[PDB]
Each structure stands twice: as structure tokens, then as C-alpha cells.
């Protein structure tokens, strides 16, 4: 729920800028002179900086060698097949080259199999210029290498084609990561309606990084593979270490956790990595059932944990969520809803995003008015009204400035 | 650039040796350690690389299971141990540094040499 | 991967080219490495990249070739060259190689 936060750049800079360099009217017969008769050369632009090159199809000279017999004036005499083997099946590779470039409009989705083949990818991979450590990290995982890498046409030339391919480089490895999520929490007041929700929005991934931590809230682009997680920090935001502490505790002073409330209560469920996670309300069916020995447990209304030993599916409603089947220790933890601690009368309504010390004010302020309204009211009932203006020496009698005469 | 190794060792068969690289003149975790050896009258033969910067190491096959390479930034210094070290161990060992820019060993230290017998 | 040096020992006069092959079995990249050890000592870079001179290295030393052959070639034989030349890769460990050496 905290998409709005993100910042917004640009993705395919560096391909564009490496394209613009490209157009110098002298670069291109550079790269061609010194890949004259060698592969997977290092070259320098006039921009000064330093790239790679890379042939991976060749046509000018198996055209060469074998247009002469079927252009020169032989009558186009047929000779025997290897003439058909070595053409048709060639030409297919630009065909689809064109054909995805034309439907994409340039860029095109991850290097399709027919831009780069896995043997010239691993040899790229060689040819790239990093850290050895680098190697068995994104060596074993093209798969998911190949979805994080765009393709950008360039230009073409005399006798040349040249598209820029980017590549992504991976700087920090091995730091802790964890996934966090959240579930609504309500009360479970007899009154339909009356109740009162809150929940925490800061599900998604936390990674340390350079002894900050680096939060990703869209968890549908964060990858995971093995115990392995894969995404980028376009889409991050630069947190202290300390906000753990919300994890563990919820009121600590250090940093101040992020809520939401709001006056609306349904069941539902989330399925988290080793177990899932049930909020039944109302009067809606709860069940978790094991595939074999059927219903083992119903649960009852508010919040509940399931771990996934023993336990194949859930039903709430109507729906049914299955649950994952990875082999891990879970750990309940035994507490109180915090929802209880909270007055009905002053609690807010509507937030769509702030912090539960922002809330412990709004309701402080509430009630501190409240009070001094209540107690200024208290004071109604001791005040009279005005006595005339006309010089009269009246007496307070019976709340009115009546001539004295009582005990005069 | 320098490449500092500690000197001559003797142990019995079956004991484990520990050699130490120090490194000045460059910045420590921006290249990766590696380590080959070569046998009296023989080539040369690489033993397995160590990054400073993550730690994460990698062993040639014929040595899986009997080295460990390890690091001190503090001190920017890499120590390889061998453990079940034989008879046929008998060779002189070289710490190296590779270049991410050009697949190459710039920088060799003055080698350490280690004799095994009973 | 194999690696195999066609030269396995070469003896010749001073001012001659005399020419070292380096041949592999797999795919090994376009990255070379030619390396000369002086006895004793330490070996030191002289061809990086297969094709790219280092610095400090006298330009008599050339380096060439791509697929499967790679070649070493001194243009004049002096008389502080008398020493033993190898053959590096990097197809994913690394692999030094027999070598050759230049008596006189």
C-alpha cells in the first residue's frame, strides 16, 4: 500500500545514451576494423569510456561464398541440398530478430532466446568484465538474469547491425533479507458495525545493506529462488536498522511503526511462507482441513496462526487458499490484541496513512478537549445575569437584580 | 603493489600448515586473492580463489575439502590452510592478485616454500 | 578444458621470430594469457586480453589468433629472453598449461 512513496527514474538511460554515442560517423568503422578477423573485443568511444563488443552471427561471408554459383550466369543450375540446409536455416534467426523488434517498438521483453542463445550469453558472462565472485551467483540463475536485462536497437550501417543489450550488475551479497506481512485486527463487539479495525502496512521485503536497510513494498516484483530473493532497489526505500525494533516491540520510542484504522470488518486470510494466517469475523465458516483426515479445527472469531505441519488446505467462506509445503520451523507467539487497549468513544475512523504516535496525539488532543469543554460546562449553572445599567443598587435575590428590600 | 608471505615451514605428514599474504599499495577488497603452487621440476597448478570483500571462496576439485581460505581486513592479510598435507605436497606456494578489468595476475609475492617429511 | 602448447621446447640463435601455439577444447572465451618465469622468481604479465601489450614490456612480443589456436610471437630473439613462457584461461576455474621453455 506504499506505491505512492516510490520515486520514479528512468530505466533504459544508459543504453540510450550508449546508442547516442554510437552516431559519430566514425565509431561503427572503428568497431568493424577492429573486429576485422577476431571475436569479443574491448573498445574505447569517443565518449572516453570503455565497452564490449560481440559478434555472434555471421552472413557476409557465407553469402559471399555461396552467391557466386546462383548469381553469376549459371542459369541458377540446381547443384544438390547443404545449398538449401545452410540458407533456409539460417535466415529464420533475422526473420524473428525483425519480427519481435517490429511488434515491440525497439525496446523489446527480456533477450527472447533468438536475440542471445544460452551459450552466447554464458560466453558474454566470461567476456564481462567483474569480480570473480560474480560468477556462480548469476551463472546458475540465466533464467532469472534474462528478465532483468532490456534490448535496445541502434542502428544500422553499411554492412552492419548492432543492437545495445543491457546487462544488470548485482554489488551486495549475502546480507540478512525477510518477508513481513499483515492481516487485519477488530474487535468483536455484538453490534454489527460498531467495531473498530487497524492494520500495518509495511508488508513487503527488508534487507540490510550498508548498515541501513532497504525496504521494498511491491512484493510482486521481488523474486525468489531457492532461499535466494532477486529484485532491484529502484523500487527501495533507505530505512535506519532501528525500525526491527517494530517487529519486536510496538511501542518503543526509538522509531514509530507504521498503521492504518478503518470501521470496516471482513474475514480473509494470507498465506504466508510456512503456515497461514486466518482473520475470521462475523458469522462466516472458518476451516482447516488436512487432505486427509478432513476437518481438524474451526476457528473462532479474531486473528489466528496456522503452521503448516499437518495441514493442506484452508477454506474460509467460500474460497479456498492452499498452503505451502517447504520444509521449516515455526515458533507461535502468545499475546494480547492491542485493540483492546483503545477507547471505542475517541478512536479515529479514517486514516489512510499515519503513524501510531500521530494517532496517541489526535486522541490525546480529543480528549484534552473533550475535558476542558466538559469542565467550562461544569461551571454553567454559577453565573448570573447583568443588573441595569440605569445606577440601580439592586440585591442578587433569586438569581435577579431585584430592589432591596428582603433586609432593607 | 606488494605481496608479503611469511617464511619457510616444515611439518610432519598428516599436519595442517597455515601461509599468510599481506597486501599493500592498493585498496584490499577491490580484487580478488588467488592461490597456485608449483612443484620442483614441475608447472604450475592452481589451487583456488578467495574474495576479501564477501568472503565467499571457491576450490578446484582436486583440492576440495582440505584448504580453507580466509581473510582479515583489518589487517587487508589472506591465510590459506592445508590440512592432511602428503608426502607429494612438497612445492612452493604464491599469492596473486587478479584484475576484474583484465583477466590477468599483475602482482606475485616472493613465494613461500614448505617442506613435509617424517 | 584441456589446454596443450604445440611447443613443448625450442632452442634458436639471437635475432630470430620464433613463434608459440596455445590450442584448447572448449569454449573458451576470447581471453588469453602469456606469462614468463624467470627461474627463481616470480612469473610477470606480458600478454593480457590475447591481443593487448602490457606496459613496461619491450614491443618485440606480439599476440594473436582467435578460435581455437592462439600464437606468441617474438620478432628478434635478444639475449635477456632466455626463459620459460605459459599459457593461462578462465573457461570457469582457471588452467595453466605445460609451457615451453627458450634455451639457447
Known amino acids: 500500500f506504499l506505491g505512492f512513496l516510490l520515486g520514479v527514474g528512468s530505466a533504459i538511460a544508459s543504453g540510450v545514451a550508449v546508442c547516442k554515442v554510437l552516431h559519430l560517423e566514425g565509431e561503427v568503422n572503428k568497431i568493424k576494423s577492429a573486429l576485422l578477423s577476431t571475436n569479443k573485443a574491448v573498445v574505447s568511444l569517443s565518449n572516453g569510456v570503455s565497452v564490449l563488443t560481440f559478434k555472434v552471427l555471421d552472413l557476409k561471408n557465407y553469402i559471399d561464398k555461396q552467391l557466386l554459383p546462383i548469381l553469376n550466369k549459371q542459369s541458377c543450375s540446381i547443384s544438390n541440398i547443404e545449398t538449401v540446409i545452410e540458407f533456409q536455416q539460417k535466415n529464420n534467426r533475422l526473420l524473428e530478430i525483425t519480427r519481435e523488434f517490429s511488434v515491440n517498438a525497439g525496446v523489446t521483453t527480456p533477450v527472447s532466446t533468438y536475440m542471445l542463445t544460452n551459450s552466447e550469453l554464458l560466453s558474454l558472462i566470461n567476456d564481462m568484465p567483474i569480480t570473480n565472485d560474480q560468477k556462480k551467483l548469476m551463472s546458475n540463475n540465466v533464467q532469472i538474469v534474462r528478465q532483468q536485462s532490456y534490448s535496445i536497437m541502434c542502428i544500422i550501417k553499411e554492412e552492419v547491425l548492432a543492437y545495445v543489450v543491457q546487462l544488470p550488475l548485482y554489488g551486495v551479497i549475502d546480507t540478512p533479507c525477510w518477508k513481513l506481512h499483515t492481516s487485519p485486527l477488530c474487535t468483536t463487539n455484538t453490534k454489527e458495525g460498531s467495531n473498530i479495525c487497524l492494520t500495518r502496512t509495511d508488508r513487503g521485503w527488508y534487507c540490510d545493506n550498508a548498515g541501513s536497510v532497504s525496504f521494498f513494498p511491491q512484493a510482486e516484483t521481488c523474486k525468489v529462488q531457492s532461499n535466494r530473493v532477486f529484485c532491484d532497489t529502484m523500487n527501495s526505500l533507505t530505512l535506519p536498522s532501528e525500525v526491527n525494533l517494530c517487529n519486536v516491540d510496538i511501542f518503543n520510542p526509538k522509531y514509530d511503526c507504521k498503521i492504518m484504522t478503518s470501521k470496516t470488518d471482513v474475514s480473509s486470510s494470507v498465506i504466508t511462507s510456512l503456515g497461514a494466517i486466518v482473520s475470521c469475523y462475523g458469522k462466516t465458516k472458518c476451516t482447516a482441513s488436512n487432505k486427509n483426515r478432513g476437518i481438524i479445527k474451526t476457528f473462532s472469531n479474531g486473528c489466528d496462526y496456522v503452521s503448516n505441519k499437518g495441514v493442506d488446505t484452508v477454506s474460509v467462506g467460500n474460497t479456498l487458499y492452499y498452503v505451502n509445503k517447504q520444509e521449516g520451523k515455526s515458533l507461535y507467539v502468545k499475546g494480547e490484541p492491542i485493540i483492546n487497549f483503545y477507547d471505542p468513544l475517541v478512536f479515529p475512523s479514517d486514516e489512510f496513512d499515519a503513524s501510531i504516535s500521530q494517532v496517541n496525539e489526535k486522541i490525546n488532543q480529543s480528549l484534552a478537549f473533550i475535558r476542558k469543554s466538559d469542565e467550562l460546562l461544569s461551571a454553567i449553572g454559577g453565573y448570573i445575569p447583568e443588573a441595569p445599567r440605569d445606577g440601580q443598587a439592586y440585591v442578587r435575590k433569586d438569581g435577579e437584580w431585584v430592589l432591596l428590600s428582603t433586609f432593607l | 603493489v606488494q605481496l608479503v608471505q611469511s617464511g619457510a615451514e616444515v611439518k610432519k605428514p598428516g599436519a595442517s600448515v597455515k601461509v599468510s599474504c599481506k597486501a599493500s599499495?592498493?585498496?584490499?577488497?577491490?580484487?580478488?586473492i588467488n592461490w597456485v603452487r608449483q612443484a620442483t621440476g614441475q608447472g604450475l597448478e592452481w589451487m583456488g580463489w578467495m574474495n576479501p570483500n564477501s568472503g565467499n571462496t571457491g576450490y578446484a576439485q582436486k583440492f576440495q575439502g582440505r584448504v580453507t581460505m580466509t581473510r582479515q581486513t583489518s589487517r587487508s592479510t589472506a591465510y590459506m590452510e592445508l590440512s592432511s598435507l602428503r608426502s607429494e605436497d612438497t612445492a612452493v606456494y604464491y599469492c596473486?592478485?587478479?584484475?576484474?578489468?583484465?583477466?590477468?595476475?599483475?602482482?606475485w609475492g616472493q613465494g613461500t616454500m614448505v617442506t613435509v617429511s617424517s | 578444458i584441456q589446454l596443450t602448447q604445440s611447443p613443448s621446447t625450442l632452442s634458436a640463435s639471437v635475432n630470430d621470430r620464433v613463434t608459440l601455439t596455445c590450442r584448447a577444447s572448449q569454449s573458451i572465451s576470447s581471453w588469453l594469457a602469456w606469462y614468463q618465469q624467470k627461474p627463481g622468481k616470480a612469473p610477470k604479465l606480458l600478454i593480457y586480453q590475447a591481443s593487448s601489450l602490457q606496459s613496461g614490456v619491450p614491443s618485440r612480443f606480439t599476440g594473436s589468433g582467435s578460435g581455437t589456436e592462439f600464437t606468441l610471437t617474438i620478432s628478434s630473439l635478444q639475449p635477456d629472453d632466455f626463459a620459460t613462457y605459459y599459457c593461462q584461461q578462465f573457461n570457469s576455474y582457471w588452467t595453466f598449461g605445460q609451457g615451453t621453455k627458450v634455451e639457447i
Open positions: 599499495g592498493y585498496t584490499f577488497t577491490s580484487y580478488d
Open positions: 596473486a592478485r587478479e584484475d576484474w578489468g583484465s583477466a590477468a595476475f599483475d602482482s
